[PDB]
Design an enzyme around this catalytic site. Structure first.
Site, PDB file in Angstrom:
ATOM      1  N   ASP A  18       0.824  -1.203   0.000  1.00 49.05           N
ATOM      2  CA  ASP A  18       0.000   0.000   0.000  1.00 49.05           C
ATOM      3  C   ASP A  18       0.862   1.258   0.000  1.00 49.05           C
ATOM      4  OD1 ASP A  18      -2.657  -0.443  -0.377  1.00 49.05           O
ATOM      5  OD2 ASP A  18      -3.216  -0.430   1.746  1.00 49.05           O
ATOM      6  N   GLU A 114      -3.678  -5.333   0.808  1.00 53.57           N
ATOM      7  CA  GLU A 114      -4.127  -5.802  -0.497  1.00 53.57           C
ATOM      8  C   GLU A 114      -5.341  -6.716  -0.369  1.00 53.57           C
ATOM      9  OE1 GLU A 114      -2.729  -3.980  -2.558  1.00 53.57           O
ATOM     10  OE2 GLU A 114      -0.748  -4.659  -3.215  1.00 53.57           O
TER      11      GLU A 114
HETATM   12 CA   LIG Z   1      -5.088  -1.060   0.421  1.00 47.20          CA
END
Ligand SMILES: [Ca+2]
Length: 179
Positions: A18, A114
């Site tokens: 991220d 994710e």
């Molecule tokens: Ca994310």
DNA sequence: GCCTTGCCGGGTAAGTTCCGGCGCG
DNA sequence: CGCGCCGGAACTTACCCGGCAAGGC
């Protein structure tokens, strides 16, 4: 140490997920090394992620500031530090030798980043198939059956699907681990 | 019957690398 | 002079989301 190793593995999962590790060249001969985690919400960053990064930074004797920069589409946690850049880049390198503790922490962070979040389905997206294959083997060792497929043919994004048959083991062992 | 999971498009929450400046031996 | 932190943001796309249907038991 292993407060540190577990938290480190977790942060790396967020960074890879991220996030990013950037070595920048400017004019000249100027340079910068960045450890970055991005996220839509300021709260998750400020009250959950930043204190973990701050603990690590203090433990490592890193002198750099945690910067929180607002973008138009997301917030950015950023540490500008050569030492921390390399700490994480070498750890990544790195990654096949993770012990069980680091494995679980990494997968947790990678899922936070994710992850399918409803948890209706248990899925991890990434373009890095080799990284998913590593996580797949680890998950198999922990007895969470899983499969990897190309999910998004447009952008070359793989999905690691965690079998809902092993849902309780995955969520209990990995996603709500007290480790 | 009910669950699981491959497939596949939508669109925004991520990611990446520019910029001008300052710090420090 | 030579590099490494700070604060910002412009830009593109890699994720997440979520509906549909085949397939398993
Ligand atoms: Ca994310």
């Amino acid at each position: 140490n292993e407060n540190v190793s577990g938290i480190s593995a977790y942060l790396l999962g967020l960074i890879i997920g991220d996030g990013g590790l950037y070595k920048l060249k400017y004019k000249g001969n100027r340079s910068e090394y960045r450890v970055v985690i991005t996220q839509k919400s300021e709260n998750l960053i400020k009250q959950h992620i930043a204190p973990l990064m701050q603990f690590l930074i203090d433990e490592l004797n890193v002198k750099s500031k945690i910067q929180i920069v607002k973008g138009d589409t997301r917030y950015e946690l950023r540490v500008s530090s050569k030492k921390l850049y390399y700490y994480f880049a070498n750890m990544l390198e790195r990654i096949r030798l993770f012990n069980m503790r680091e494995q679980i922490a990494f997968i947790k962070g990678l899922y936070v980043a994710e992850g399918d979040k409803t948890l209706k389905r248990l899925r991890i997206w990434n373009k890095n198939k080799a990284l998913l294959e590593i996580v797949s083997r680890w998950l198999n060792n922990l007895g969470v059956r899983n499969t990897i497929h190309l999910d998004d043919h447009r952008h070359g994004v793989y999905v690691l699907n965690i079998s809902l048959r092993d849902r309780i083991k995955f969520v209990h062992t990995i996603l709500s681990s007290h480790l």
